[PDB]
């Protein structure tokens, strides 16, 4: 992969692997989310971020700060087939003192048509205390060197799905998958649960009949608290709806502490 000509965005191509695809022989939304995170890591490395797994700036290391995900939003028009080449372009934007945004466009390598788009919100956290904070002047200056200074949105529309408020599912849930736990393959190189794991866990409470007869079009996931290596998760889903819509809650199996909430939109094949 490479920075584009102007050095303000990054492009990489991926061949879809045998083990990356579901029943339709097309890439899972989990495979898509891993590729988004891979190209994001390759971009961060190319613009001089830390290579220690935390992807920090100089100022962030000095102040013991990290980025954590607040939200991930993916819309897929066409899942790439097994052996297909997908091209993903990604860039970052500063959002004042609130946080930062990473955006992605997915294209068919052969046709050059857009097959999906994604957006993520990141907030600043002290690594030691785990307390959220605002972005410092010095960090905002670091982001000016490698981000477009005019707005560039994967989701430009002024009232678009990627920014909708998500309500909290009320008991009883319509469907549930209980006693979900992470294994070592679910952890990143710093022994935190991979953000993509939480996508899989949400989808586990979707009935197999939906997955068999629908394609996932849109997923919006809010991240509230991280699952520790030794935590156990319950995944809850209620139908809110030819298109199927669902409300999602992940919560700790014991005390019912919220870790994530989300929505999915599915269209019949």
Ligand X SMILES: COCC(=O)N[C@@]1(C)CCS(=O)(=O)C1
The site string for a second copy over 164-203 (x = CB under 8 A, - otherwise) reads ---------------xxx-xxx-xxxxx--x-x---xx-x
- d(CA 173, CA 238) in angstroms, rounded, equals 6
Binding residue (CB under 8 A) for a second copy from 6, 23, 172, 269 = 23
**25 scored as a contact of a second copy (CB under 8 A):** yes
Helix (H, G, I), strand (E, B) or coil at 212: helix
Q: Which does 102 bind (CB under 5 to 8 A by kind): a second copy, ligand X, none?
A: ligand X
For a second copy, the closer of residues 9 and 31 by Cβ is 31
| Residue 231 in contact with a second copy, rule: CB under 8 A | no
Q: How far is the CB of 133 from a second copy (least distance, A)?
A: 25
CA nearest neighbour of 77 among 133, 128, 106, 116: 116
In order of 22, 191, 234, the CA distances from 25 in angstroms are 5, 31, 29
Partner from a second copy, ligand X, none contacting 92, C-beta within 5 to 8 A by type = ligand X
- Closest to 215 (Cα-Cα) out of 201, 197, 203, 198: 203
Instruction: Return the axis-axis angle of helices 195-204 and 29-46, rounded to nearest 10°.
Output: 170
Of these, 14, 67, 198, 201, which contacts ligand X (CB under 6 A)? 67
Instruction: Tell me whether the omega of the peptide bond preceding residue 97 falls within 30 degrees of 0, making it cis.
Output: no
Exposed/middle/buried for 235, CB within 10 Å: 0-12, 13-18, 19+? buried
Q: What residues from 74 to 93 belong to the interface with a second copy (CB under 8 A)?
A: 82-83
Which residues of the shown chain bind a second copy in the complex (CB under 8 A)?
Answer: 17-19, 21-23, 25, 28, 30, 34, 37-38, 41, 45, 53, 82-83, 179-181, 183-185, 187-191, 194, 196, 200-201, 203-204, 211
């Amino acid at each position: 992969g490479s920075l584009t000509e102007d050095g303000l965005s990054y492009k990489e191509k991926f061949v879809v692997r045998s083990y990356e695809v579901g029943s339709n022989k097309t890439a899972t939304v989990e495979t898509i989310a891993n590729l988004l995170q891979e190209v994001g890591c390759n971009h961060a490395q190319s613009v001089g971020f830390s290579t220690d797994g935390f992807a920090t700036t100089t100022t962030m290391r000095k102040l013991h700060l990290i980025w954590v995900t607040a939200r991930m939003h993916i819309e897929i028009y066409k899942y790439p087939a097994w052996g297909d080449v997908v091209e993903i372009e990604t860039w970052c934007q500063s959002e004042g003192r609130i946080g930062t945004r990473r955006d992605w466009i997915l294209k068919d390598s052969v046709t050059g048509e857009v097959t999906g788009r994604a957006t993520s919100k990141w907030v600043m956290m002290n690594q030691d205390t785990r307390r959220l904070q605002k972005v410092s002047d010095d960090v905002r200056d670091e982001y000016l060197v490698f981000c477009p200074q005019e707005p560039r949105l994967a989701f430009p529309e002024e009232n678009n799905r990627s920014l909708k408020k998500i309500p909290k599912l009320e008991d009883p849930a319509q469907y549930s998958m209980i006693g979900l736990k992470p294994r070592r393959a679910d952890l990143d190189m710093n022994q935190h649960v991979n953000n993509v794991t939480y996508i899989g866990w949400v989808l586990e409470s979707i009935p197999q009949e939906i997955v068999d007869t629908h394609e996932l079009q849109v997923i919006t996931l809010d991240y509230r608290r991280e699952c520790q290596q030794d935590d156990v998760v319950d995944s809850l889903t209620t139908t809110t709806s030819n298109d199927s819509q669902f409300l999602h809650l992940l919560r700790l199996s014991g005390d019912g502490q919220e870790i994530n909430r989300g929505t999915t939109l599915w269209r019949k094949k």
